[PDB]
Amino acid sequence: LSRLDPPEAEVQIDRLITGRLQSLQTYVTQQLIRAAEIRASANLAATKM
Amino acid sequence: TNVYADSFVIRGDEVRQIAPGQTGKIADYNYKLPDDFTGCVIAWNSNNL
């Protein structure tokens, strides 16, 4: 933001935003799968109890 | 909806300055266009006039 004009800062920030939100989506998907695994484990534990 | 026709006269060397995201004396102290400008720009020499 502090070195370039708004027209160019727009493109640069666009690249950064794309990368970061892609990273967030990857993290969320991993969390969903791991949570499904934990839910299966918890159901087994409750059945054993 | 409407058409705004803005007219003036300047030296040819500054013609390039009339565009979105431009810099210069014209672009900063004389006539400023928005970055998301939509429309047309027309210029022709008038040295005879």
Curated annotation (Swiss-Prot), chain A:
It comes from the Viruses. Subunit of the fusion protein that is processed upon entry into the host cell. Mediates fusion of the virion and cellular membranes by functioning as a class I viral fusion protein. Contains a viral fusion peptide that is unmasked after S2 cleavage. This cleavage can occur at the cell membrane by host TMPRSS2 or during endocytosis by host CSTL. In either case, this triggers an extensive and irreversible conformational change that leads to fusion of the viral envelope with the cellular cytoplasmic membrane, releasing viral genomic RNA into the host cell cytoplasm. This is Spike protein S2'. It comes from Severe acute respiratory syndrome coronavirus 2.
